[PDB]
Every structure is written in C-alpha cells, then in structure tokens.
C-alpha cells in the first residue's frame, strides 16, 4: 500500500515531533512524557497505530525506515531516534537537547 505509506509520511512529515504508540504503552508513555517535559507539545503529534485497521502495514513500515516494528517510534524534523531507550540516552548524553536548540524548540 502506497496509500498507508502516504499515511504514515504525512505524519511524520506535518510534524516536527512524531510518536508512534499503541494502547497502553508504559515506554510510549514515558518516551511521550519526556518529550511533553520540554513543552513540545505544539509541534508534537502521537498516533495510536494498535487502534487502527492496518496496523502490521504500519509497522512493518516503520521497521523498514527505523529498523525496527516496535512502539514506541520516534522521529524528529524525519530523523529517526528510534524507540524510548533511544531517546533516554540522547536525553541523557545531551543530543535530544542540541536537536531541539538546532529547531528553535528550546532555547
Ligand atoms: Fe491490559
Ligand atoms: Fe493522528
């Protein structure tokens, strides 16, 4: 399917923070509150891809552009971070926080 490939491209393309998760996630959440933790709310979107008809699409997607199938996924600006330990070492080792300054996101 193009049409969920084009999905999923909008997603990660119309915002500059994009989260893929699935129902009742403890690493979505955590990855999501972090990022939430730097008030990227406003240029964050997540989306649940468990409650919706193509999901295995969806995923099988995301592994081809991350390497992985698994929730979460994390892109920033369409750089792929990866899954919530990835964004826990960039957090801790200061690259998610040169990320946002070279965005404008934090100051
Ligand atoms: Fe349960
Ligand atoms: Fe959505």
């Known amino acids: ?3 969920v490939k084009k999905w999923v491209n909008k997603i990660i393309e119309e ?3 994009a989260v893929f998760a699935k129902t009742e996630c403890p ?3 955590k990855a999501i509150s972090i990022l939430k933790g730097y008030n990227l709310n406003s240029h964050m979107h997540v989306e649940n ?3 919706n008809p193509d999901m295995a699409n969806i995923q099988a997607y995301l592994k081809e552009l991350t390497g992985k199938s698994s929730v979460p996924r994390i892109f920033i600006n369409k750089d ?3 899954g919530c330990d990835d ?3 960039e957090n801790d080792e200061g690259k998610l926080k040169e ?3 070279k965005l404008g996101l934090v100051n």
């Open 87 to 89: 964004l826990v070492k």
């Open 1 to 3: 399917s193009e049409a």
């Open 80 to 82: 792929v971070v990866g």
């Open 27 to 29: 690493y979505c959440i």
């Open 99 to 101: 990320r946002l300054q």
């Open 15 to 17: 915002n500059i923070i």
């Open 49 to 51: 891809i468990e409650k």
